[PDB]
Amino acid sequence: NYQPTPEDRFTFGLWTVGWQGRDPFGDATRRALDPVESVRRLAELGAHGVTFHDDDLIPFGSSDSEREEHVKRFRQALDDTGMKVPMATTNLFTHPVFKDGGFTANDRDVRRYALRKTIRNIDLAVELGAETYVAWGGREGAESGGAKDVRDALDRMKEAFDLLGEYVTSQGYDIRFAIEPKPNEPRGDILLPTVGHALAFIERLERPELYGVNPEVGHEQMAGLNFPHGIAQALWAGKLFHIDLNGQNGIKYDQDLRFGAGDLRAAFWLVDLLESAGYSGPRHFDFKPPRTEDFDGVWASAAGCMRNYLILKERAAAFRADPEVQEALRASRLDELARPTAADGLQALLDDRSAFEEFDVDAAAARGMAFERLDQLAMDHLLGARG
Amino acid sequence: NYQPTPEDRFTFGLWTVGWQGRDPFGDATRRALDPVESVRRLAELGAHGVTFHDDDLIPFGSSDSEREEHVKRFRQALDDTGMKVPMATTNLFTHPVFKDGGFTANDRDVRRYALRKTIRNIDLAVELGAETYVAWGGREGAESGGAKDVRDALDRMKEAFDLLGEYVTSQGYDIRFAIEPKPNEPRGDILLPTVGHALAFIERLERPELYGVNPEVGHEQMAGLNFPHGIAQALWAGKLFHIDLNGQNGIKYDQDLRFGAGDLRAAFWLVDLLESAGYSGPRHFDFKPPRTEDFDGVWASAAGCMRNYLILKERAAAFRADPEVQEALRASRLDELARPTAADGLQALLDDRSAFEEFDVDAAAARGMAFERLDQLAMDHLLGARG
Amino acid sequence: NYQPTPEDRFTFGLWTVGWQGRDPFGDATRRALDPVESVRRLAELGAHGVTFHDDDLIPFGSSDSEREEHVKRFRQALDDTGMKVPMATTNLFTHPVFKDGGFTANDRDVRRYALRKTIRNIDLAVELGAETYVAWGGREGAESGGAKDVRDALDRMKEAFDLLGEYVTSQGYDIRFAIEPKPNEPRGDILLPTVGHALAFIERLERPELYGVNPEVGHEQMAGLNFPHGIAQALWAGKLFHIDLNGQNGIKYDQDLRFGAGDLRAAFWLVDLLESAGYSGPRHFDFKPPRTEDFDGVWASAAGCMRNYLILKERAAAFRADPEVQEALRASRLDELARPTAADGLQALLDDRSAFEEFDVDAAAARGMAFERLDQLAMDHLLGARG
Amino acid sequence: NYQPTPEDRFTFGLWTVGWQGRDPFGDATRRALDPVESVRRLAELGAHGVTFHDDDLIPFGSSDSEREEHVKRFRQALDDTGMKVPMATTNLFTHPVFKDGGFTANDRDVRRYALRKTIRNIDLAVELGAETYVAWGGREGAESGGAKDVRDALDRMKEAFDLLGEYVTSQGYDIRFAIEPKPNEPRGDILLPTVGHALAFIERLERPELYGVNPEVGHEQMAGLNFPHGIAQALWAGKLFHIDLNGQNGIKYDQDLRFGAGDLRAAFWLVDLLESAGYSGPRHFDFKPPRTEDFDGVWASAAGCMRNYLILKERAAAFRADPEVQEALRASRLDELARPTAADGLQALLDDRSAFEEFDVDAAAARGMAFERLDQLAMDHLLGARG
Ligand SMILES: OC[C@H]1O[C@H](O)[C@H](O)[C@@H](O)[C@@H]1O
Ligand SMILES: OC[C@H]1O[C@H](O)[C@H](O)[C@@H](O)[C@@H]1O
Ligand SMILES: OC[C@H]1O[C@H](O)[C@H](O)[C@@H](O)[C@@H]1O
Ligand SMILES: OC[C@H]1O[C@H](O)[C@H](O)[C@@H](O)[C@@H]1O
Ligand SMILES: [Co+2]
Ligand SMILES: [Co+2]
Ligand SMILES: [Co+2]
Ligand SMILES: [Co+2]
Ligand SMILES: [Mg+2]
Ligand SMILES: [Mg+2]
Ligand SMILES: [Mg+2]
Ligand SMILES: [Mg+2]
Questions:
Q1: Which residues of D are annotated as a binding site for Mg(2+)?
Q2: What domains are defined for chain C?
Q3: CA angle, A348 then A352 then A358, to 5°
């Protein structure tokens, strides 16, 4: 079973299945993919849609004429398949001009160029139906302490995003921005390194309602953080506009393994959260088929992304629907966590002797939380061993 | 040289020099310190003031009578020395009743107790002259995914902090709150794990102006993050109310080494930022003398904290005052980072052909940033090798 | 199903289920367990045997008289249940005298004491039937660079282990030593931090055949290493004398979660290796029930250790027995890895033009490894989704 | 001051200063360097010598004719400058044929090719005067558990190194091998991931005297290990044949910063060890000038490598020569660490009541180690603040 269909909202970046396998120590192991072929092959696997950087679709430095022919070909393929383009983004990291950043490059003329390059692709993104425009500032940062005044850099970053929002607002576009955090690589430290830092920064923008986050499983895991917890906080703030799904084995370089690889239990708790919170955005895969693979392995790895999501969804639904799990949740007082601590108010709390003067601290301390039995039920459900 | 004086604003927690050296695998190696003796010994070392958890000063479970005698003794010592109490905090982590948290414990009655325990110590803190009240939620979190609904937990955490602000507001107290993040330990994952997550959460509180952060060097380093960058972001947001200074060697358990130990270059860039941003709060040391040490080693380690700050301050001031460093900063275009990207406005940017159509991307890409020469000047200044 | 029986060779340390839950920031949450009660409760869960530190069984500082009464009581419990004692070890880390180490303490008289304390417990271990004597040097190490001359420390460590082997040899005991590595905690860096370092060091001992390793899942994971790979290397060397099973979420403090928690796919590949290599030693659990739990949660967590091993064993056996997996292994050329590279010899290799001069490097480079399809079969088997 | 001269034995890889700055997310920012120009520019900076991969010097796929012209040009440059070639190595990682490894590729014909490619460059290395031949198995490893049988892979790795030693032995070459460990990148996990694992593996080779290690500062730091401790263990074993010097900020991708950047105190303790142990091999820099830099920044970064070594050497010599530091070392009993624990023998130890029965454990436990005062003296010396 576990066959994906378009209703599952699975999307892929052109740059994922199209990764040629060049890494810091090795040349490409696969030939380039025509974006048209990717659209058609992904349609046939059950995907909902594709996403793109400007430079994935239009080779850098293309004339106005060549650009229009690349776009018309791609549009033809989308029209033939019904495939959607829910998200687009800008490549502000590959070309050598961006070696010190785009929006926060020390050189002012690079920052202006970065903004104009971005603005041009927003126009295309909106024409193609994108609802979210992602910004990953992979070159915004430093290898050394004196190279970047971080307060000035944040001024410039706020300036850039404020201008993008003025632009979308002035055009009447119905598109929103999502900032994708990453703690490091390819810069020694990248600005806004986690979901938390990006959420804080959004609250200083002129129009914070236009901006949310695009968290990536493996990126938060490169800081050793709990990805489901961070997604919970982004949901709680109302800012989970988009999400990048993949796998990562711990704190090391950015692996971009297929979703479900890496930390499998984190993947389980992630799917449980997304589904029980009713997240309705794309399930987007930002992953790289390992460079050991040929083109058959590329499509196997892509199918595996969707397969693992669908299996985990099933196990998480079975977990929450199990009356034994519901009983375990009550034994662990998850339901008391949802009750307000003091809806009776501050004065009532202060005058309540049962909350302090007469509180039996030893009796309360003695109560087991019963968390291990609950977690073993979760393990049994994940492994399909409830029998 | 490098003798500290009270004007340097160095402060210490009672629980730092007073750490008896019990760790997860070993019993105490030092006898307990009388808080009065700590105040006097710290005064003689040059400290500005001390800080405390409620339970450092008043043994847990003390009667109203015993509590008043502990406080009067301590007040006597402060009055005799002129030592200040700029910050206080609550112990919501040692007693077994807090094993699932304080403000976000699943059990409602523990959460109510946690709030009443906190409120009582705010009253004492304000009476003693504290300007900042720190909250470190070291038990707020989980070892397993099903144990904590993180959205409900954030509701309860917001509820608790909103009530604390209502309380200080209703009493007319002039005291502000600072949330201290930590990514893990003693819980498997702790809620609000970084400076970023804490900053974001503050923006959802009813009265965000009452709350800032208390970042700790070693805690952000337990997520492998760049501590100066995070402090820069907290300054940029106006939320650096307090700071914990210490050392940490990488991603492992929380070491709480004396300041300057651990990542020495990060300490250098930290001091350079605090001094050039004009941070005027306490330089507070949250550190543990290693349990190898006797009481002479405790006071040597404490003196070393202040000594290393003063040496680094001197090297950072010499760095910024060096005309060769100023020249290097200009060669790296740090001054162009402070110029607005587009103060001419969005329409002018769109109509500027030099920012895109006629932008010579190859010429710009060819410009070296000269960052290594600048960083070697910083190294030479840190090592006192400018000769 | 998945009921453990004594034939499964599951063992537990007295100090695991008996952990009272004192951590660096909190007091005990559970009362102490009588070792007799642990033996009986573990027998009833299906365990094969127990292990112990000297100080778990005999309170430190006991008289010759009290010691004999503690041991006779324990022996009575083993005799009543048929429970075995396959392994024992020394506590050279809790008492303050060991704060700078046991075998590599700077003070010579502590090192002599450490050896005499160890030798006394070897006698007891052998009397009780232990086949392996584990050494975990948790205090051997340093927080600072100048505190320990590491070459001299390794001399002292070799000296200590050489003396232990002379002792067992002179007594004619049939017991072997296993060194348990850990990279850090409670010391800033611990000597012999990984399986690799311990294996190398053994080769410099006078009688290397008496010494192997006791690797712990979570310890190698605290260095971000691949635990199955390290176990493979220890097997390849013939030195896997014992093993500690538990779980760990990444690079942070030592969590000692129940086995199967933490990195679940690593647990799967671990069980697959142990079973396909025919490891016949104890499956020993060195874990801590979280301090959130009461005594019912202690025994639930312990049962969960054995349960997860048995489930993973089943999934790994099904994986290897699947003809589709066998086909996938051949497509990935795992069988060609077992063929010698050049059993024809060096001169034949040098004269073979097909290995260099006429080797079609492009054809070989083009071959996909088909690793993702193989790994998705492994995922399907782990999740019980082969249907 | 701190001017390097050839007597300082500083060496550089052609691939360091010649790094064009292509990273996983960006194209080259610098033009290629002619190896002849590197030799001459490095001679003028004070370098002792250069090192090379085969493919740095001879473009891959060169004819016998083109190869001889590349080598003669390079030889001319060495002869003109007196520059030495103390070490050489093989590129078994860039070409797509090595995507699953060289010596441990699943495909047998790739392994044979890998050996023939290596053997050809040993001949050249010896002709040019190299004393050490380094092997870095950067593609030996896996992204997934089923892809590599690690025991079979270690068989193949031992087979390959045994054949290389037979070859050098049969030719009568006076050259030795050094294995360079790395824990991960570009493979998900690399075989022999640390200095420890490499040392253990050497002891299973047919002729272990021909093999040692080439540890790299940043590589051991990618596992969060203490690099000086690991070097101490390699010295203690007699296996430090070569060393790679650079910098790394923690557990993340391999940064290859200039030496002295990254963990500065670790660099200090490293230089103190190398100099006090009398290491007499090359001080080799395996580093990458950041891709932000132009060619002036390349040579500034290279000079900085040597500069920082010379400054740290001076500070470490001043540290050890300080009578106050000698006094501190005695107070911390570093001199008692060098005394044998029991040169009186096992029977004398067993019969010594002062080592156990009459050992005053409380008196010994009470002794402070005085480590913090010693470490603050080390800090003062590193920072040039002894005044
Ligand atoms: O933002 C779009 C994408 O850009 C790059 O490919 C990044 O590596 C990826 O993290 C991000 O999702
Ligand atoms: O908040 C006050 C202090 O509480 C605890 O001692 C924490 O370990 C420390 O991180 C914090 O600063
Ligand atoms: O060696 C016996 C045991 O000693 C301690 O309890 C260690 O924490 C554990 O790692 C080890 O297995
Ligand atoms: O072995 C020679 C060198 O090969 C590669 O360039 C590696 O990245 C470097 O780590 C190693 O020293
Ligand atoms: Co990624
Ligand atoms: Co801390
Ligand atoms: Co452990
Ligand atoms: Co490197
Ligand atoms: Mg992404
Ligand atoms: Mg703190
Ligand atoms: Mg263990
Ligand atoms: Mg190297």
A1: 180, 216, 219, 244, 254, 256, 286
A2: 1-387 (3.20.20.150)
A3: 170
